[PDB]
Scaffold this active site. Sequence first.
Site, mmCIF file in Angstrom:
data_model
loop_
_atom_site.group_PDB
_atom_site.id
_atom_site.type_symbol
_atom_site.label_atom_id
_atom_site.label_comp_id
_atom_site.label_asym_id
_atom_site.label_seq_id
_atom_site.Cartn_x
_atom_site.Cartn_y
_atom_site.Cartn_z
ATOM 1 N N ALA A 89 -8.469 18.523 -8.970
ATOM 2 C CA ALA A 89 -7.534 18.022 -7.960
ATOM 3 C C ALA A 89 -6.699 16.888 -8.567
ATOM 4 C CB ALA A 89 -8.301 17.534 -6.742
ATOM 5 N N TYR A 90 -7.372 15.919 -9.179
ATOM 6 C CA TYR A 90 -6.678 14.823 -9.850
ATOM 7 C C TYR A 90 -5.635 15.357 -10.833
ATOM 8 C CZ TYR A 90 -6.075 10.713 -12.928
ATOM 9 O OH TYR A 90 -5.596 9.668 -13.679
ATOM 10 N N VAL A 103 -16.426 12.251 -11.084
ATOM 11 C CA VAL A 103 -16.863 13.591 -11.511
ATOM 12 C C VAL A 103 -18.107 14.066 -10.734
ATOM 13 C CG1 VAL A 103 -17.616 15.009 -13.499
ATOM 14 C CG2 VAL A 103 -15.810 13.311 -13.791
ATOM 15 N N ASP A 116 0.895 -1.148 0.000
ATOM 16 C CA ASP A 116 0.000 0.000 0.000
ATOM 17 C C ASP A 116 0.934 1.199 0.000
ATOM 18 O OD1 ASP A 116 -1.661 2.198 0.805
ATOM 19 O OD2 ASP A 116 -3.115 0.781 1.622
ATOM 20 N N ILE A 117 0.860 2.006 -1.061
ATOM 21 C CA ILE A 117 1.817 3.125 -1.216
ATOM 22 C C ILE A 117 1.590 4.264 -0.217
ATOM 23 C CG2 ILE A 117 2.112 2.440 -3.625
ATOM 24 C CD1 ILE A 117 0.772 5.103 -4.494
ATOM 25 N N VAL A 166 -4.003 18.191 -10.865
ATOM 26 C CA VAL A 166 -2.840 18.745 -10.152
ATOM 27 C C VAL A 166 -1.943 17.631 -9.593
ATOM 28 C CG1 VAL A 166 -2.029 20.314 -8.305
ATOM 29 C CG2 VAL A 166 -4.029 20.906 -9.651
ATOM 30 N N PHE A 170 -11.489 10.761 -7.501
ATOM 31 C CA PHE A 170 -12.896 10.881 -7.152
ATOM 32 C C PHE A 170 -13.719 10.973 -8.425
ATOM 33 C CE2 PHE A 170 -13.181 11.482 -2.530
ATOM 34 C CZ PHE A 170 -11.821 11.550 -2.215
ATOM 35 N N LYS A 195 -1.431 14.820 -10.858
ATOM 36 C CA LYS A 195 -0.717 14.252 -12.009
ATOM 37 C C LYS A 195 0.326 15.231 -12.567
ATOM 38 C CE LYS A 195 -2.588 10.066 -12.153
ATOM 39 N NZ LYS A 195 -1.853 8.770 -11.924
HETATM 40 N N1 LIG Z 1 -8.468 5.995 -18.463
HETATM 41 C C1 LIG Z 1 -7.838 5.527 -17.397
HETATM 42 O O1 LIG Z 1 -8.319 4.436 -16.737
HETATM 43 C C2 LIG Z 1 -6.555 6.253 -17.018
HETATM 44 C C3 LIG Z 1 -6.065 7.266 -17.865
HETATM 45 C C4 LIG Z 1 -4.883 7.941 -17.576
HETATM 46 C C5 LIG Z 1 -4.174 7.605 -16.422
HETATM 47 N N2 LIG Z 1 -4.662 6.598 -15.563
HETATM 48 C C6 LIG Z 1 -3.854 6.241 -14.384
HETATM 49 O O2 LIG Z 1 -3.629 4.842 -14.585
HETATM 50 C C7 LIG Z 1 -3.340 4.231 -13.284
HETATM 51 C C8 LIG Z 1 -4.204 2.944 -13.077
HETATM 52 O O3 LIG Z 1 -5.595 3.299 -13.020
HETATM 53 P P1 LIG Z 1 -6.765 2.350 -13.454
HETATM 54 O O4 LIG Z 1 -7.591 3.051 -14.474
HETATM 55 O O5 LIG Z 1 -6.235 0.978 -13.756
HETATM 56 O O6 LIG Z 1 -7.619 2.389 -12.085
HETATM 57 P P2 LIG Z 1 -8.213 1.228 -11.173
HETATM 58 O O7 LIG Z 1 -8.905 0.210 -12.008
HETATM 59 O O8 LIG Z 1 -8.990 1.928 -10.131
HETATM 60 O O9 LIG Z 1 -6.926 0.547 -10.552
HETATM 61 C C9 LIG Z 1 -6.090 1.304 -9.672
HETATM 62 C C10 LIG Z 1 -5.097 0.374 -8.957
HETATM 63 O O10 LIG Z 1 -4.326 1.212 -8.049
HETATM 64 C C11 LIG Z 1 -4.443 0.608 -6.757
HETATM 65 N N3 LIG Z 1 -4.296 1.566 -5.633
HETATM 66 C C12 LIG Z 1 -5.052 2.645 -5.344
HETATM 67 N N4 LIG Z 1 -4.589 3.202 -4.213
HETATM 68 C C13 LIG Z 1 -3.540 2.463 -3.796
HETATM 69 C C14 LIG Z 1 -2.663 2.515 -2.707
HETATM 70 N N5 LIG Z 1 -2.777 3.478 -1.779
HETATM 71 N N6 LIG Z 1 -1.683 1.590 -2.603
HETATM 72 C C15 LIG Z 1 -1.541 0.605 -3.503
HETATM 73 N N7 LIG Z 1 -2.372 0.516 -4.538
HETATM 74 C C16 LIG Z 1 -3.371 1.419 -4.701
HETATM 75 C C17 LIG Z 1 -5.857 -0.012 -6.765
HETATM 76 O O11 LIG Z 1 -5.999 -0.979 -5.721
HETATM 77 P P3 LIG Z 1 -7.495 -1.307 -5.151
HETATM 78 O O12 LIG Z 1 -8.057 -2.455 -6.050
HETATM 79 O O13 LIG Z 1 -7.207 -1.904 -3.720
HETATM 80 O O14 LIG Z 1 -8.361 -0.089 -5.132
HETATM 81 C C18 LIG Z 1 -5.810 -0.704 -8.117
HETATM 82 O O15 LIG Z 1 -4.974 -1.888 -8.074
HETATM 83 C C19 LIG Z 1 -3.666 5.306 -12.229
HETATM 84 O O16 LIG Z 1 -2.432 5.920 -11.766
HETATM 85 C C20 LIG Z 1 -4.529 6.291 -13.018
HETATM 86 O O17 LIG Z 1 -4.423 7.605 -12.490
HETATM 87 C C21 LIG Z 1 -5.853 5.907 -15.874
HETATM 88 C C1 LIG Z 2 -13.472 11.862 -19.982
HETATM 89 C C2 LIG Z 2 -12.450 12.015 -21.118
HETATM 90 C C3 LIG Z 2 -12.941 11.269 -22.377
HETATM 91 C C4 LIG Z 2 -12.208 13.502 -21.416
HETATM 92 N N1 LIG Z 2 -11.132 11.391 -20.675
HETATM 93 N N2 LIG Z 2 -10.941 10.994 -19.509
HETATM 94 C C5 LIG Z 2 -9.703 10.502 -19.376
HETATM 95 C C6 LIG Z 2 -9.190 9.973 -18.172
HETATM 96 C C7 LIG Z 2 -9.991 9.113 -17.402
HETATM 97 C C8 LIG Z 2 -9.527 8.571 -16.192
HETATM 98 C C9 LIG Z 2 -8.250 8.921 -15.723
HETATM 99 C C10 LIG Z 2 -7.458 9.798 -16.474
HETATM 100 O O1 LIG Z 2 -6.217 10.126 -16.018
HETATM 101 C C11 LIG Z 2 -7.918 10.332 -17.687
HETATM 102 C C12 LIG Z 2 -9.077 10.608 -20.637
HETATM 103 C C13 LIG Z 2 -7.840 10.295 -21.232
HETATM 104 N N3 LIG Z 2 -6.819 9.724 -20.578
HETATM 105 N N4 LIG Z 2 -7.639 10.589 -22.534
HETATM 106 C C14 LIG Z 2 -8.589 11.151 -23.267
HETATM 107 N N5 LIG Z 2 -9.781 11.451 -22.749
HETATM 108 C C15 LIG Z 2 -10.052 11.204 -21.443
HETATM 109 N N1 LIG Z 3 -13.646 16.464 -8.786
HETATM 110 C C1 LIG Z 3 -12.547 15.536 -9.156
HETATM 111 C C2 LIG Z 3 -12.766 15.046 -10.594
HETATM 112 C C3 LIG Z 3 -11.817 13.904 -10.911
HETATM 113 C C4 LIG Z 3 -12.102 13.266 -12.268
HETATM 114 O O1 LIG Z 3 -12.016 13.925 -13.306
HETATM 115 N N2 LIG Z 3 -12.419 11.971 -12.219
HETATM 116 C C5 LIG Z 3 -12.671 11.180 -13.428
HETATM 117 C C6 LIG Z 3 -11.365 10.475 -13.836
HETATM 118 S S1 LIG Z 3 -9.903 11.576 -13.946
HETATM 119 C C7 LIG Z 3 -13.652 10.057 -13.159
HETATM 120 O O2 LIG Z 3 -13.688 9.511 -12.065
HETATM 121 N N3 LIG Z 3 -14.405 9.736 -14.205
HETATM 122 C C8 LIG Z 3 -15.391 8.638 -14.165
HETATM 123 C C9 LIG Z 3 -16.766 9.029 -13.609
HETATM 124 O O3 LIG Z 3 -16.918 10.149 -13.080
HETATM 125 O O4 LIG Z 3 -17.646 8.149 -13.716
HETATM 126 C C10 LIG Z 3 -11.184 16.247 -9.006
HETATM 127 O O5 LIG Z 3 -11.178 17.505 -9.068
HETATM 128 O O6 LIG Z 3 -10.164 15.527 -8.828
#
Ligand SMILES: NC(=O)c1ccc[n+]([C@@H]2O[C@H](COP(=O)([O-])OP(=O)(O)OC[C@H]3O[C@@H](n4cnc5c(N)ncnc54)[C@H](OP(=O)(O)O)[C@@H]3O)[C@@H](O)[C@H]2O)c1
Ligand SMILES: CC(C)(C)n1nc(-c2cccc(O)c2)c2c(N)ncnc21
Ligand SMILES: N[C@@H](CCC(=O)N[C@@H](CS)C(=O)NCC(=O)O)C(=O)O
Length: 275
Positions: free
Chosen positions: A191-192, A95, A61-62, A194, A93, A196
Amino acid sequence: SGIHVALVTGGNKGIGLAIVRDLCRLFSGDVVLTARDVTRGQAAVQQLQAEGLSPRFHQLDIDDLQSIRALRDFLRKEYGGLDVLVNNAGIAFKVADPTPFHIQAEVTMKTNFFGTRDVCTELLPLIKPQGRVVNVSSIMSVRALKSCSPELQQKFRSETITEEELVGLMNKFVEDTKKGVHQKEGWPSSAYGVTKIGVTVLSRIHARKLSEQRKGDKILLNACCPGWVRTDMAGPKATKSPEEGAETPVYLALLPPDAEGPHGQFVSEKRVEQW
Ligand SMILES: NC(=O)c1ccc[n+]([C@@H]2O[C@H](COP(=O)([O-])OP(=O)(O)OC[C@H]3O[C@@H](n4cnc5c(N)ncnc54)[C@H](OP(=O)(O)O)[C@@H]3O)[C@@H](O)[C@H]2O)c1
Ligand SMILES: CC(C)(C)n1nc(-c2cccc(O)c2)c2c(N)ncnc21
Ligand SMILES: N[C@@H](CCC(=O)N[C@@H](CS)C(=O)NCC(=O)O)C(=O)O
Ligand SMILES: CC(C)(C)n1nc(-c2cccc(O)c2)c2c(N)ncnc21
């Protein structure tokens, strides 16, 4: 020399799991799936075993410094270090979440920035020559940067910023939200996003320090975006499968030996983006 080892944080589901799967097939050495929940981690290992693969497991757990330290000690004892580190773990979190913004800021920052940083503090010293480090940021970091004040953009683009300066800035964002002044102080509304920015700039600083302090060691470290991936984070409407989302991180993890770059870059779809 000894057996090579790759490790993925947040490896039990989503992009992390897909990265583990690919490293099991493509990495020449042991692959450690880590997860904060031991049950979920072991279930994921079983899933991959049913696919014919042999990942190792270790809890992580990070956000728990003792958990990070136990993993550090394990790697030192069993392997004498670490070859590939994928900082994939992250949270967001939804949206629609009515959680007060200042709590969203503190909680998201705690994991995505401080957790990731803590893992790097303990594990970067273990990275072996020809090692690779991959920090999973987000294109949202580039989007968020554009919404920062010019003053903050300059600081975040700086080639001389220190990790401790960045820590100050990340904590400043969180504190500013608590004081109801984040917009006035030049911060964006995500917040997310920032957090990143934090991951991306941390990557840039760590790459610099590697080049300055470990010249000749052939280590490459980059930030990336996996694209928009169907996971528990982004939801089911996203365009990529976890398999597709893993492609860029796995690419960066497996850069061939002696490769000169990318290094210190933000990479999306296997391509270097301007920061
Ligand atoms: N479109 C996208 O999905 C997208 C786009 C751009 C960037 N990202 C980034 O891609 C990465 C993976 O996200 P994902 O979409 O695969 O999300 P996810 O399905 O929610 O998986 C997130 C993983 O991170 C783990 N995690 C969360 N908090 C942790 C902690 N404190 N210590 C250890 N592990 C923890 C979760 O464990 P639990 O199962 O226990 O919750 C899970 O294994 C994240 O850094 C996310 O910001 C995602
Ligand atoms: C919701 C939209 C479609 C704007 N979205 N969300 C994300 C997104 C969703 C969850 C996590 C994240 O870092 C980004 C995204 C992405 N990576 N590339 C392009 N479009 C994206
Ligand atoms: N209020 C949040 C918004 C975060 C956000 O944009 N969350 C997106 C992923 S980056 C999300 O959870 N999208 C899926 C959904 O809302 O169902 C913040 O400021 O960090
Ligand atoms: C070619 C790679 C190594 C990427 N790959 N991917 C996959 C693969 C195929 C479908 C889904 C998946 O997650 C991974 C695979 C396989 N099943 N057998 C052999 N090699 C495979």
